[PDB]
Structure 1
């Protein structure tokens, strides 16, 4: 992967690399000039020549062809795939070029949260875009700030007292949803999920079966991270994740504890947690009830945290759907 990606390289006898936009576990994303389409700047996703990543890239191409046909106008803000090809055995997917990811923008902005009015517009477009996936019998499973990309990330800088530092602000906060390598149809086989992120729905952790509601859980964690600048579940361990949920959201439902086959996490009916160990001391300091994370008692802030609490409902059946989430009072200002 280190060898076929540098700048100046030409792919498929038309795409000329000019910049690197990101490097991850699957491989690379590079910016290219398409010399056979008037010099249109495109984004090309270079996938490692590994079995699991090639199979995911093949499934993502099939999903993208379906979404491009079902939504040719891209009304529902899924990224448009232009074409795909192979290059030295690596699978390459050409995309319409977008801006920075919301994680990238947050990082390059000193990890400062977004203004509430921008969170509102972004949350609405994310819910509409992922509801489009759900209407087409699809589940994304890997929703996170890195996979939410601004259409255009031009900004302005200004100093902010109270923060006592410079703060960037989007000009246009329009976004798109990317990465469909883990996208799963309802009729397809549902796995038990890779290290998906510090966003793992409780039904996913407890192996109770998952579907569309697990996307709603991820969006709720996306919103609080947009509102704070940091995730509320800073961990990669599953039992530690469950202990953070109990501190932030409350106790797990008894029925979910009863059915789960992951006895590894539990001691009888309670979570097998030592709150005086290293991790237990961290969870105590880093975690608190959800509402205590609020930075203002303004009603618009309580409308947002009402939406997050509904999206962070433990039971996947009780959990609000994106169809109902788009009717929430938090989005009344947009109408």
Structure 2
């Protein structure tokens, strides 16, 4: 009764898994911490709900994780490792390496004042390497759900991170789900109902990295129209050649007689298009977010200008010219 598996702390599965406790949850089902008695090690077991839509999503996840594990490259280690999968009490069970807390928990630890530019840079470099791996031709995987909750520290003391949750993922050219990406991290092409490729993940990364340094979401929309309005506050009206091709352009925008585009007024205010400058959100010249980094080492105007320049390349409206992972890794923000 119910789609979830019932789990009692202390119980043992197939004389092997000491279900320690419950460490996670989602629309997919539950994640449990269990000791693998046979392998003398902690594992995270993702227990998929007994519902066809979530079972179908998890079989795509198993297939893409096994595709990735076939690759001889050190880059694959920014992706969470699937150890095994089996059916148990009519639930699909995915056994993962045990990781530490997600990047939202890390922000909550700072009272949402943000982590340092130095740590932000370390997360940025690993995430760009993970996106480079996903962009390998034979993979061409779109994650489609990048958010701080889906980026996990390997260890609570170190900077090493891994991407989890390929449940909403697809490969280049697929259209499977009605709505994709977590709203705050959703690319303009997805809001506009346009075709989407690996560039949507780069957009999400841009939003994530600003949130990690400032402590608060760059674009916190309560709905799709509010999301697009928040993006326009910072980046201005999207290019006419994009909006001219966009199925949902008229959800947000209106074409003038002279051929130019403006915001549709809401059925009711926002800052004028492009007036909420990322320069001021980052506090490039005013001591960083809320002035809290003033004088601190690793928070110079020069460091901030490189960060801002890389972020604005990740948040390019045009998915064709948006910076790609290979080029992102060559940016002066990452220079030793």
Task: Determine if contact 2:145/2:181 at 8 Å carries over to the other structure.
Answer: no
For the residue of structure 1 that corresponds to 2:55, the secondary structure is helix
| 2:305 is aligned with 1:302 | yes
CA distance in 1, matches of 2:172, 2:321: 19
Task: Determine if contact 1:44/1:92 at 8 Å carries over to the other structure.
Answer: yes
Task: Determine if contact 1:142/1:197 at 8 Å carries over to the other structure.
Answer: no
Match of 1:272 among 264, 277, 291: 264
Quote how far apart the aligned CAs of 1:103 are.
1.2
Task: Determine if contact 2:237/2:262 at 8 Å carries over to the other structure.
Answer: no
Match of 2:224 among 231, 238, 246: 238
What does residue 258 of structure 2 align with? none
Change (3 A) 1:258 1:73: closer
Unaligned runs of 5+ in 2: 256-260, 286-300
1:221-236 equivalence runs, <5 A: 221-236=207-222
What does residue 327 of structure 2 align with? 324
What does residue 97 of structure 1 align with? 98
TM-score by length of structure 2 reads 0.86
1:66-215 equivalence runs, <5 A: 66-71=67-72, 75-135=76-136, 136-154=139-157, 172-186=158-172, 188-194=174-180, 196-215=182-201
1:33-70 deviation digits (Å, cap 9, x = unpaired): 01121x21111111222222111101000111111111
Task: Determine if contact 1:147/1:177 at 8 Å carries over to the other structure.
Answer: yes
Quote how far apart the aligned CAs of 1:264 are.
2.8
Unaligned runs of 5+ in 1: 155-171
Larger CA deviation: 227-236 vs 115-124: 227-236
For the residue of structure 1 that corresponds to 2:44, the secondary structure is strand
Match of 2:245 among 259, 284, 289: 259
What does residue 23 of structure 2 align with? 21
CA distance in 2, matches of 1:3, 1:212: 34
Match of 1:33 among 35, 57, 67: 35
Change (3 A) 1:256 1:190: farther
1:213-252 deviation digits (Å, cap 9, x = unpaired): 0011000001001111110111241111111111111111
Quote how far apart the aligned CAs of 1:112 are.
3.0
CA distance in 2, matches of 1:13, 1:273: 62
Count of residues in correspondence between the two structures: 309
Quote how far apart the aligned CAs of 1:12 are.
4.2
TM-score by length of structure 1 reads 0.86
Task: Determine if contact 1:12/1:87 at 8 Å carries over to the other structure.
Answer: no
1:297-335 deviation digits (Å, cap 9, x = unpaired): 321111111111000000000111011100000000xx3
